[PDB]
Structure formats: C-alpha cells, structure tokens
Design a protein around this ligand. Sequence first.
Ligand SMILES: CCOC(=O)N1c2cc(CNC)ccc2[C@H](NC(=O)C(=O)Nc2ccc(Cl)c(F)c2)[C@H]1CNC(=N)N
Ligand SMILES: *[C@@H]1O[C@H](CO)[C@@H](O)[C@H](O)[C@H]1NC(C)=O
Ligand SMILES: *[C@@H]1O[C@H](CO)[C@@H](O)[C@H](O)[C@H]1NC(C)=O
Ligand SMILES: *[C@@H]1O[C@H](CO)[C@@H](O)[C@H](O)[C@H]1NC(C)=O
Ligand SMILES: *[C@@H]1O[C@H](CO)[C@@H](O)[C@H](O)[C@H]1NC(C)=O
Ligand SMILES: *[C@@H]1O[C@H](CO)[C@@H](O)[C@H](O)[C@H]1NC(C)=O
Ligand SMILES: *[C@@H]1O[C@H](CO)[C@@H](O)[C@H](O)[C@H]1NC(C)=O
Length: 335
Amino acid sequence: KTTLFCASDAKAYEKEVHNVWATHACVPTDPNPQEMVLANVTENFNMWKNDMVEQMHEDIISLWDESLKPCVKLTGGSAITQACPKVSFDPIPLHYCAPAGFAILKCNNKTFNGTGPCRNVSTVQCTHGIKPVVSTQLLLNGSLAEEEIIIRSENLTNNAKTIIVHLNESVNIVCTRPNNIRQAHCNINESKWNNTLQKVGEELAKHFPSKTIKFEPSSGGDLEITTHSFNCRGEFFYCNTSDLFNGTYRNGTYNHTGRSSNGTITLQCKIKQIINMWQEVGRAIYAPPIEGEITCNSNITGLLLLRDDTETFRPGGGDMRDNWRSELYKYKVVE
Ligand SMILES: CCOC(=O)N1c2cc(CNC)ccc2[C@H](NC(=O)C(=O)Nc2ccc(Cl)c(F)c2)[C@H]1CNC(=N)N
Ligand SMILES: *[C@@H]1O[C@H](CO)[C@@H](O)[C@H](O)[C@H]1NC(C)=O
Ligand SMILES: *[C@@H]1O[C@H](CO)[C@@H](O)[C@H](O)[C@H]1NC(C)=O
Ligand SMILES: *[C@@H]1O[C@H](CO)[C@@H](O)[C@H](O)[C@H]1NC(C)=O
Ligand SMILES: *[C@@H]1O[C@H](CO)[C@@H](O)[C@H](O)[C@H]1NC(C)=O
Ligand SMILES: *[C@@H]1O[C@H](CO)[C@@H](O)[C@H](O)[C@H]1NC(C)=O
Ligand SMILES: *[C@@H]1O[C@H](CO)[C@@H](O)[C@H](O)[C@H]1NC(C)=O
C-alpha cells in the first residue's frame, strides 16, 4: 500500500548499533499513542502476504549492513572487504508507523491464526515495539500469545510451508561461552520444555487428528538452519537442538526423548566466523570472538517448524521474514 516509517526509543549516546541505526533512521515514539476500537467491523488479514514484512525486512537488512559489517562478504564471485570492528549489539524494539493519510489496522482477536476475517479491530498509528531478532528454529524475545498457543501457516496441508508456533508462555534459554574459545552451551529447564511440547502437541493434534505427533531434530541443510543459530552480543552462535526437538506426543501425552540431565537440557554450541547470510545468498566472514563470558538470557516465545499414522515436525527457519511475520501478523496498513 505505502511507505511506513519507524519510531524507536533509542538515544544518541548508546554506541549499541541498533541504537545508532534507529537514531538515524527512526523518529522518536509518541509518549501516549492512541488506539481506536471498531469491535463490529470485521476485516480480513493475511499475515503471509503483508507488505509490512517486506518493509521491515528491508530495514533490518539496512541495520545489519551498517552495524554488523563482515570482514569479508562473498557474493557471486565477488568478495568485498571492510573493517569489521567488534561492536555493542543488543536489539531494541522498533515500531512501524503509518504516515499521514494511512492507518494500521490491528486485529484484537487473541486467537487469530493470522489469515482470514477478524472481528474486533482497532486503528493505530504504530505497531507495538518489535525487537528485530534474527534466529532460526526458535523465535526469541517475541510477544507471547495471550490466550492459547496458536499455529500459523500459509497452508497447513502444504508441508513445504513453514509453521509458526506462537507460545503463550516464555521458555528460558540461556546461552553462554564461558571464561576452545569457539565452544559454548545453552540451558533449557527440561520441565518447562516438557510442558511446552505437551501443549504444542495438543494444538498440532487438533489440526492433525488421527495421528501421533513426533518432534525430531532437523534433517539437513546449512548449519544455520539445522541448528538453532542466532547472534549474541555480536557473535554468531550455532546450537545443536537434537536433544530439544526430540519427543513423541501420542495418547494425549507427550514423552520427551532427547537426553536431559539433572533436570535441564544442554545444547552444545559453536561460535562461528563463516556465516551463510540470511539477507541474500552469500557468505560473510567475521573476526574471531571477543573475550570473556558471552552470555544471552533469552525467552523462547515461538517455534518455526516444518512437517514431513504419524506426522513428524522438525525445526526450521532461514527466511527471516517469517520472524517478522510472527510479530506483524496482526497488523495491516489501510487507506
Ligand atoms: C533471501 C532470504 O534467504 C532465504 O530465504 N534463506 C533460506 C530459506 C530456507 C527455506 N525456505 C523457506 C532455508 C535456508 C535459507 C537461508 N537462510 C540463511 O542462510 C540464514 O538464516 N543464515 C543465518 C545467518 C546468521 C544468523 Cl544469526 C542466522 F540466524 C541465520 C537463506 C538464503 N541465504 C543463503 N543461502 N545464504
Ligand atoms: C496456553 O495454551 C495451552 C494449549 O493451547 C493451554 O493448555 C494453556 O492453558 C494456555 N495458557 C497458558 C499455558 O497459560
Ligand atoms: C486459519 O483460519 C482460517 C479461517 O479463519 C482457515 O481458513 C485456515 O485454515 C486457518 N489456518 C490455520 C493454519 O489454522
Ligand atoms: C494447500 O496445498 C494443498 C496441496 O499441498 C492444496 O490442496 C491446496 O491448494 C491448499 N489447501 C488450501 C485449503 O488452501
Ligand atoms: C548435533 O548433535 C548430534 C549428537 O551429538 C549429532 O549427531 C548431530 O549431527 C549434531 N548436529 C549438528 C548440526 O551439529
Ligand atoms: C534423541 O536424543 C538421543 C540422545 O539424547 C539421540 O540418540 C536420538 O538420536 C535423538 N532423536 C532423534 C530422532 O534424533
Ligand atoms: C533477548 O532479550 C534479553 C533481554 O533484553 C537479552 O539479554 C538477550 O540477549 C536477547 N536475546 C537475543 C538473542 O537477542
């Protein structure tokens, strides 16, 4: 429909790079914005074909190119070389705002699966604050569904279509390279993982009725999608998830099958310098890791799954727009 603009809450004295970018590219946020219900209106949205996602994707690409410059960038046969300073890197929330003459409709149905008609609807200047968090397999630091877990998919029959599971309760994941310099690990409380895959299996079961629901670690691909990869404090972690996506939900009960220990699942992570870019088809080389404890304490707030009697779900990811979709699903720009 139109060109959106961003409102952030960053300040010009942070050397953190999301702050720097936002202070150049975004306008300050309205202290008290004002909504505008319309609980009879009913309009349709389709999260899977939402231009707001394109615009945000463009902006995050811009952000990363100005903030996480790689020492080397291989695209086609070209290699570009730049200074790759280590930087202060912690994502801040970004608001997307409709400019003069445009408004953002926001669907208020707390169970809205993200496509089709929605009943309660509001008008807003801006989205909520969205932390543009690049990762695969697990979505981190998002907003939780407020009712029940919600399964989103462009077409649940088409197994080639990424499924976004929207959790209603955070699950902590703590990743640390402590004080091999490239080796780290993550801790998830196996009990709350336990429960979470319980409930996720229930919801997947309503969509998949005759069948037993198996979680299995991702088959093949680049490391960035066969492991839970993400950026912590500038460094690209790649964490093994085969003790995480490893479980069976059969008789209305979930049985976890990956190996736990003293009540917590522990993922082996590598920090890596040679990255398969999400922005485009290419490779990006970075400097070896900073020193000391690198630690990220994050909320797993959704999953990205792919489906292959039994239905099997393995972790997925790689198309960063799905991350943005998970947060922008309940908004469209109109007028
Ligand atoms: C233009 C958008 O590209 C795409 O849709 N991709 C896509 C799509 C699919 C499946 N289809 C739905 C599978 C794999 C990919 C690739 N994803 C990454 O590479 C990717 O996520 N890396 C990474 C890097 C750093 C971090 Cl921290 C991170 F968390 C992730 C990408 C192509 N890029 C490439 N082959 N270099
Ligand atoms: C979250 O969703 C699950 C299943 O959809 C439900 O059992 C649970 O009560 C919901 N709310 C929570 C867990 O707070
Ligand atoms: C979402 O709901 C619409 C109708 O509201 C339905 O057509 C579609 O199958 C649902 N999709 C999922 C993934 O639940
Ligand atoms: C989803 O894709 C399937 C094929 O995988 C096909 O029957 C149809 O086009 C889609 N179904 C719906 C309900 O849109
Ligand atoms: C993850 O760990 C398992 C068991 O150690 C191993 O078999 C698997 O290949 C690993 N995957 C990756 C992508 O490192
Ligand atoms: C589940 O975990 C065990 C060890 O923790 C591993 O041997 C097994 O291969 C995993 N399941 C799958 C389907 O990979
Ligand atoms: C998630 O948010 C917490 C608190 O803001 C932060 O410490 C953590 O590093 C974030 N995780 C990622 C992957 O950015």
